[model samples]
Target: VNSFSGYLKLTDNVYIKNADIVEEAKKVKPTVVVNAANVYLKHGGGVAGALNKATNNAMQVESDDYIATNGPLKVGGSCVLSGHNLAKHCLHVVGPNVNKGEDIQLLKSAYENFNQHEVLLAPLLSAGIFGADPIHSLRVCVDTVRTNVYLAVFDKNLYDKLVSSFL
Candidate 1:
């Protein structure tokens, strides 16, 4: 297990951690695990891919079935599926891609997709390969939560930025 500690409290219901979703979820056992997904919802790569690997691709198959029936998700759109190997629920949120053209409103929706859950294990949407600004992405994350929420940040620099910013 990767050991790390330190949490920045944003509110009674929200906090930030320098850890990835999968690792945090394994221990915290949140009510839902939020997957950082593309509109296609393919679990073959990135943060989604890691979760897919850990859950034995159950979520991937379920996502495929979902897409077959409902079509691809629009930016900011989201859906929940089973988190087979970990949390009971997995929320797949399609974030805004600044490099591709981002709609801040859409990013807000993607971040706010949780009207929505308790102790949610979520990533900083659009902050990775999607290329959205990490600080901006996290601000929305902090502002969106109404209940227990953990910001599962994986990048050391990004996590350090968050921690230092808080101080």
Candidate 2:
């Protein structure tokens, strides 16, 4: 629930904490919740899974239709889901797959794909389970998201690292 101010070069703001990402999102109550998703729009793993469970799988079911009709989502592409139980808006981006070891350029593109808004909550895309370097990915995320952005950190270790770096 705490935020570190005046220490970032890209993002408007940064939040580092050892709390549930969903709970933090609820508190911030951003206008949009942007998450890293796959081509299938499946929120079955990583941060996507947490969002899916929090919303009772509504996002998964709804986004499935979006992809089916619009075609397979590619890396750096986004799909907005409305009528979600949690946030008023949910933006899903097809991020780099860790198994594929996608280049940093593509990882950066994923962060850049989002349409900047008044307020947004997003995780470090292509980082964590996606296997991209956390610091590197964070740099790209901050560089891309110019609006008020909350970067959620769920792990205690990660919270410390980010805080140390930013503050």
Q: Which candidate number would show the highest TM-score if scored against the true structure?
A: 1
The CA lDDT at 5 in model 1 is 42
Off by over 4 Å in 1: 1-6
Candidate 2: the clashing residue pairs are none
Relative to the true structure, candidate 2 reaches a TM of: 0.84
Residue-wise lDDT of candidate 1 within 1-167, one digit each (tens)? 21224667777766787787777878766668889888888977778898998888788888899999999998998998887877888899999877787786688788777767756778888887788888888777777768677777888888888767752
For all predictions, the C-alpha RMSD in Å is 3.2, 3.4
Clashes (backbone N, CA, C under 3 Å), per candidate, total: 0, 0
lDDT of 2 by residue, 1-167 (tens): 33333223333454434566687666656668887788788778888998888888887888888877998888777777862666788878777877776655777667765645666677778867788777776667666765566677677797677666652
How far does residue 80 in candidate 2 sit from its true spot (Å)?
A: 0.9
lDDT per model vs. reference? 0.79, 0.70
Prediction 2 global C-alpha lDDT: 0.70
